Amino acid sequence: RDQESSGFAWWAGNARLINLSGKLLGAHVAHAGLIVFWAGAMTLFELAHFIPEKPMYEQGLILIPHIATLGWGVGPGGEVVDTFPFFVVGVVHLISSAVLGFGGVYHAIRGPETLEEYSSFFGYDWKDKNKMTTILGFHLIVLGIGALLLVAKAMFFGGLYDTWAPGGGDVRVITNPTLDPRVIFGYLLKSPFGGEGWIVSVNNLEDVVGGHIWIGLICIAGGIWHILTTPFGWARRAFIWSGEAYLSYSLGALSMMGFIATCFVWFNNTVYPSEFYGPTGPEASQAQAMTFLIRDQKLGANVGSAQGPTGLGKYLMRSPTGEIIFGGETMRFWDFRGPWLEPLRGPNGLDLNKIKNDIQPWQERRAAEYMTHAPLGSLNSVGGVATEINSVNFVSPRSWLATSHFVLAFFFLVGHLWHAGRARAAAAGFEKGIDRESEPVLSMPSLD
Template sequence: MQTYGNPDVTYDFWAGNSSVTNRSGRFIASHAAHTGMIAFGAGSNTLFEFSRFDPSLPMGDQGLVFLPHLASVGIGFDEAGVWTGAGVVTIAIVHLILSMVYGAGGLMHAIYFPDDMQKSTIAQARKFKLEWNNPDNQTFILGHHLILFGVACIWFVEWARIHGIYDPAVGAVRQVNYNLDLSMIWERQVNFLRIDSLEDVMGGHAFLAFAEITGGAFHVIAGSTKWENKRLGNWSKFKGSEILSAEAILAFSLAGIGWMAIVAAFWCATNTTVYPVEFYGEPLKQVFLIAPAFVDSVDYSNGIAPLAHSGRCYTANFHYIAGFFALQGHIWHALRAMGYNFKDLGAKLRVAAS
């Protein structure tokens, strides 16, 4: 975190990031606890929506968010493609159980395990320490993240291929094989909002899995050996050794999260292949109120949808707003990482005003 030249600076309790700046054990604890909160929210809200869901009415008219996500990946249907809700409660309970596991893991890392992984008695654990002036260390951790993301993509592709997902074109769950067409994948970089083929969607995920696992393996190797310094010259500078810090890593993370959230918002608002009308409601209109927003294109004031909005409207606007503020956080922390002292801003404004 930015210390403004004071190595002994202290932060108030609300500056939560400062407590994990140089404590990799606490950093892991916060990640695990945060994951537990997300799992609890997913499980509990799924049960809540399932308790109020009326299968005799269109799902898209009931303002749901979690059930549509399960339905779109083929969970809740029988072999004939009829909605039964089978498996929904199981998924919710599994998430609630996992929330307790993640929560316990967060507590153990916060209370029982070392606050810094460099103090661990396990050699493998010590590799996940935080050394901001050591690009190899950051690259090693990045590689593991990429590999896990790639495995998740493979899981999704194989789920669609073996179990099947919902295809709005046929109104039923069907098995989807991925279309690994590199020209299509390249072309979809600029018009993915209009994608209308589930095979293309799975092809993109298959390619992404390959790219992430390959890149992750490279980063794990490059971050745990010194071969790159001999073969590629001063590789450390290329990897950003002069700009890496806790503040910079936070800025990078917020930039990625913010951009993906805004992309998801536009995709959810307009696409009806990945976000079927049957589950999410009709596509949204883009308007400018106090700020850019998405509004329903049809009237949902039927007394069923909460606050008379579709689940598509809730999902798109939440992602857009969260993405907007994440990008503002990126700018704030990126400037601090580059050494900008926001405490000088007030003085400069006072001088300008006088």
């Protein structure tokens, strides 16, 4: 537990737990406790500062909108009807953190230093390819079950919040989840660029629930697979099989997932309902063009023939493929889809006749609301652009969530690079420096 014996300094002291399964178990369980702790403590915090009639995205909340999306404590339009489910989630997560915190400490500073001669089932070796895939299998099944919990919630227990629900957003039970692999895996084969958007562009709960059904069965089957099998030859020669190497593989995964989450909460308004998280970037911008189209048309303006300074339509123009879109700088956001705008959308895009006659006041309210709540804010939470004066205390939750998980994702990519590079060097035997006396370069022919 010092540097002379372990070979690691205090700033790398957790690297001494590599070959100590017992204490390492206590470390992970204790860290897990910290996770469930925050998930509960913050929930109670958010609920304590929560104001029912005031919008969620105006109160700096990130956890309550997650619970609300699952259909708990909300009704039509995303209005809060009962704050009690928020309280239960916060309390249960919190109490559980004491349980994980109890065994986390026990397994760490008094549980067996190694599990290998307490138990052959719990005890492991990093280089035991069979043991690792087995543990991988177990946890794969656990993840598969968790995905089915979401399915069970959406199909059997109340359902989820459907922002695309007819008559307005409401909690809806998913009865027909999409099982079609042409749709589910169709998302996975979509382009990550504009107009497509990969898996981020999922716009209905049917594809979400049906999607988690697939990934549920896949992880379970995969779990059973890795439990019953052992790594093939081509896999044994490709990877590095060590504790640090496995960590780096997971660091790269979480880094990728971090970047994906960043794009989800910033672009997607289905699994991240605008009634809870606030309008997206593209959404708010389209709402401004919407807001002033309505205002000007009331004054007697013909928004279909209104030419702008550049020659392009002031309110309405065409996308590169010909779709009728909102004019101005928001031409870049013509791939935005929202339940408040789709009623005005025809086969060729925005229908001018629907615009002239069918626009409803609730659409006008929502447009002005989302325009004035665009995800633009300073670090000290001053709403609007940088040149705006102090008055509105607002930064959209989407901004907090997108920024935070990009910082984390990037650093975990660095983590991947750091821990994978060292895993290669360590397994090869030169992570502690070049042997002065077998310097590989000196045995190589000169470059010139």
